[model samples]
Target: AVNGKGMNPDYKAYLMAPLKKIPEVTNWETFENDLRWAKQNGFYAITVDFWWGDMEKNGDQQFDFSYAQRFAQSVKNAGMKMIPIISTHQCGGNVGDDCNVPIPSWVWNQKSDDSLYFKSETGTVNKETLNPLASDVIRKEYGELYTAFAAAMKPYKDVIAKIYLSGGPAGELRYPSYTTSDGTGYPSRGKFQAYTEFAKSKFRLWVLNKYGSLNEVNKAWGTKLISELAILPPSDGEQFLMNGYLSMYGKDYLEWYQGILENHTKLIGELAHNAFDTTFQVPIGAKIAGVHWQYNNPTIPHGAEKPAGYNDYSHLLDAFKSAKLDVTFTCLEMTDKGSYPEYSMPKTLVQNIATLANEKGIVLNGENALSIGNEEEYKRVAEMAFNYNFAGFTLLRYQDVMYNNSLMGKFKDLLGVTPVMQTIVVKNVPTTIGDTVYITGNRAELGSWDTKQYPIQLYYDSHSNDWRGNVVLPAERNIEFKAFIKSKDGTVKSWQTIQQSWNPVPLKTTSHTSSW
Candidate 1:
């Protein structure tokens, strides 16, 4: 999605397949098989997860792109696109239940002077992931990682469409709400992230920058701690009394905590933009975790108002919007979970993100993290995505789709892998013997009024004494276009009479006829 052009490539609907984390393989046979399956299933592109901890296990700041290079070549050789997910912060520990190390152990070993991890209010480290606030270490090192990855991928830049910069836990920007210890391995109520001295110092500066003095901070937080805006909020302690509802300091505290996440995300994005600018230039995007929406969740610690530390969709979108990026992907899950089978979130979350994306001139892509059980259910999900004007919809993963060929075939048919294109049949249109008939329009898919862009040349039908051609427009949308002729000498003829219209055309294949 560009600033004024709308969706890139016009009717830009894509099916992206996920090539999961690097697998242990004796040979390249499995890789090739997955690539072939993806192409066969109508997926034009695949996202390969490059685990940071595994790639840089040798030492800090060390990386080997040997495997990544092989994967890229295989993907291109199989006639498909590639998207690399640079999973800098690992997920197997501290955050998700996955069995992978978050970051290389050596990086954490220097925590004493390095300030590498987010500091807990109790002066303990999360020990699960690197803190973005540690800009000197994590930010610089990850930026170098991106630069290294770009250098390795320079050979295949044409095939790589976008780079997914992973942020925070599980590659989404949010605080650690759950832990692996305690009764249920979940944090108690009202636990927020980013309480370290580093975060607190930054918060103090942010408040001063926003309010000009500690007096304003005192007034906003309703606290008497003048000149002590750096003091941690009461909720930062174990008791968790300052839940921000009745307490005056709750809202301000929430803002400060959320501000840390937002700032961290923005910094990471800027680093990616700078690192990748050297040898490659493509849209960079981040995968956003959907809103938990389980406010007041008993098993969870947070309340319904979505406290400061929560991954609020609006806040995340706004932060990314202010950063340097071209696309934002939302991990929209719709399937019922085992524990909360009946639980479902409002579609407005996605609707609001899409609205924000358009306003910010960024492409919006959505994926259903969980699978859609049946064809009917999948269709509903697809329809909602299309209506929202998402640049693309990525199904869960390639491996799962491969296990169910029936589901794959049905999904392909539903999404119009064999799309119903519009056929234009022109009769009795005057044209010179050497002139070539063509059409131009206001869409990038239709040449965008430029003869050289999509070049929709028409073929002469001898039997009908006319020219005929076919076009594919986005489903159920109004389109305005014009027909013209290009002479053998490369001169373009004026549009015939006036422009033509295809108003609210059906998605199904249909024919249109006109005369000059």
Candidate 2:
């Protein structure tokens, strides 16, 4: 690991096999064989989903863990750990899903409330997961569900890698912002999920708490309504995106929407922590969706994210801190495509999230959101994970990787063989907002004295108050580099006078402090 001592013991890789049903690996012989194969292939673990749909299929509190017990036994037989997702969300709706497992069917009947599921603006009920605003119902519901899980899996606690708490749709901590029902998938401004009476009631109360009275609320929101009951999310999303966010009312609405999401996720994390933190003696895991599209849209900047109930992540991480869960993110395979078509910046999103998580002292891990067979995608993902000091990486799907030995071989080289270059740290540099620093040196990793391409861009380290980045350079050769400052508009501002040299390379950190 290049960033040794500063990084967690590097998580090499984990294989995620698709599960069509509870105990999808039903044939014990084949299951054990696959697990043994995974263990032999240097995989740390195999991520599995323990669907609530199957765990308690018939009724609430009535669990049939015989399947789970068998599954755990097979994993134990194969000498591999299990990364279990207590998936309260349906599986089929998500990308790469070849299964049709839904959440416990009885939950809806028990609630007897129309708001048990998320309501889209078009009156489409998103049954992919339960509504986040249903706090009172979900608190008791998740509390017992987690308790049941801990008790059932207690026997095989040794094989448990970590328990992931699924707080919302697709086992991620976010709303069902974009669904197939409305064709609001990928790069489109997803409709906000807030139209049910229950959703409206909570919004009404949230607004009332803020303003203290209906009169003040009306004035703030610029509305002539009867009472606090009239308070609602903007009936029109496009209207809100184009112009509403500029108003005080729109800002407050966005806050409350995100607040509700944070509240649900925090509660779920707390439940998982109380259940697993002591008993399992492992960190709790939380997966966050990488909704990077429309991230830079000016009028609807983060427009694609609003329906997902998150635009700002700082507040979200605070909730994770409060819960003491390790943060996991998706879409590591994606690079930034900041051009006309998609307007997505996945690399930038990961960088921003990694920077913030590091600043907050949060443990971070990630996975590729979509299945890919490309070697460059794998390399890009590895580069980001290693550079950011990510603790874990999970490649999606067993069907692809089980046959593609080249993929695993590529990962093995990426996982183990990269030279542990000294973490470069530059200081006393004069720069302003949006201005940046890059390192170019004698080695190819440092662009071979050419800053035109492959120059290592150092991120601003808030803790160290310096420009820093970890690199994987060629060993046995002395490395040299100079800092180049560039304006936001791509003009070379100024550079270091002296060429910094790491003679014979270095096994420790390199700190070069100087003025231009």
Which candidate comes out best when scored by TM-score?
Answer: 2
lDDT of each: 0.62, 0.77
> In candidate 2, what are the lDDT values of residues 1-516, reduced to their tens digit?
222222234455687866664344346777778778767666778888888888888887898777778888888988889888888888897777888889887788866667688787888888888887777768877888888989989999999887788978888888888777876788877888888888888888888999999899888878788966668888898888888877888899889888887888778987888777778988788888999888777667777777888767999888788878889999999988865545688999998888789889998999988877877787677667756768788888776667788876665555422345467778877999879888777643455565554467777889968887766553344667788888888777888888888766554546444444
Instruction: Show pairs that collide, candidate 2.
Output: none
Each prediction's TM-score versus the true structure: 0.71, 0.81
- lDDT tens string, model 1, 1-516? 111122222323344444334454323666667677767766767776777877787786678888788888877777778878787766565432335555677777666753566554444456555776677776767878888888888999988877888777666666554444321132233245556666667666766777777787778767687456445654444345333344555556567667777887788888888888666787788866555344334443333224325535566567877886555455343532323422234354565667777676677777765555577756555544544456666676555566788888776655424234788877677787788888766643454566653456778998888888766555555667777887788788656677887886577888877885
- Candidate of highest lDDT: 2
Give me the runs in candidate 2 sitting further than 4 Å from their true place: 1-8, 21-26, 416-516
Clashing residue pairs found in predicted model 1:
92-98, 92-100, 189-301, 244-250
